[PDB]
């Protein structure tokens, strides 16, 4: 079975959904954790310095 097109047909599982906290469609409904804001993992909002150039 090809890992390409033929394996694309079974993709009907819902994971990332609209997040109650940040509004982004990143709330993983299986993990109950937002990949964008950290909701469900952290009380503090998810944020990293690598999201921008080092001197900025």
């Amino acid at each position: 079975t090809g890992a390409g097109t033929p394996s694309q047909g079974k993709k009907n599982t819902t994971t990332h959904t609209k997040c109650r906290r940040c509004g982004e469609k990143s709330y993983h409904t299986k993990k109950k954790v937002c990949s964008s804001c950290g909701f469900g993992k952290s009380a503090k909002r998810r944020d990293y310095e690598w999201q921008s150039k080092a001197g900025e």
């Binding site: 819902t14 959904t17 609209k18 469609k25």
Partner: protein, 46 residues
């Protein structure tokens, strides 16, 4: 799929947003909905 009451409100809103710029606005501004979404060609969130 089984939608919840909240999901339903959002889908509802998306359908409404998916309308056109009324004809009078065109006149009132002496003369485009950039948020037009097709059920097939486009994909909503959730």
């Amino acid at each position: 799929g089984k939608k919840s009451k909240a999901t339903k409100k959002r889908l509802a809103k998306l359908d409404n947003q998916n309308s056109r710029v009324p004809a009078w606005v065109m006149l009132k501004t002496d003369r485009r909905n950039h948020k037009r979404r097709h059920w097939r060609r486009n994909d909503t969130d959730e």
